[PDB]
Amino acid sequence: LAGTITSGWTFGAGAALQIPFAMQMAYRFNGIGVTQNVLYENQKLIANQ
Amino acid sequence: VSGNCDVVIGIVNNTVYDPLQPELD
Ligand SMILES: *[C@@H]1O[C@H](CO)[C@@H](O)[C@H](O)[C@H]1NC(C)=O
Ligand SMILES: *[C@@H]1O[C@H](CO)[C@@H](O)[C@H](O)[C@H]1NC(C)=O
């Protein structure tokens, strides 16, 4: 769990790299087909949800 | 580019360069 937040999904693959969690979430969103502007613009709301 | 600069958090002032303008001038 600690690894996921700090390093996202990168550590399982190899040595962990530190990335911002907000940025990490954005990368996952792209996977689902939603651009990054959507996550950042609605970032305040998403945290609450 | 999709928005206003105020909405995003942690955005840093910087200059973005366009290749097209130089050639036009
Ligand atoms: C980033 O962290 C620093 C800690 O010194 C903080 O001052 C800054 O507000 C943070 N950036 C944000 C919330 O965008
Ligand atoms: C640079 O960023 C700061 C953020 O505090 C902002 O107040 C300022 O207007 C920005 N500079 C511009 C848009 O030239």
Structural contact between residues A38 and A47, judged by C-beta atoms closer than 8 angstroms: no
Distance, CA of A12 to CA of A3 (rounded, Å): 9
Looking at beta carbons, which residues of chain A come within 8 Å of B2? 35, 37
Copy the structure tokens of residue A23: 């940025």
**A37 touches B at CB < 8 Å:** yes
3-state SS, one letter per residue, for B1-25: CCCCCCCCCCCCCCCCCCCHHHHHC
Resolution in Å equals 4.3
Best CA proximity match to A18, nearest among A5, A27, A1, A6: A6
What's the longest Cα–Cα distance across chain A? 33
Contacts A–B by Cβ distance under 8 A: 13
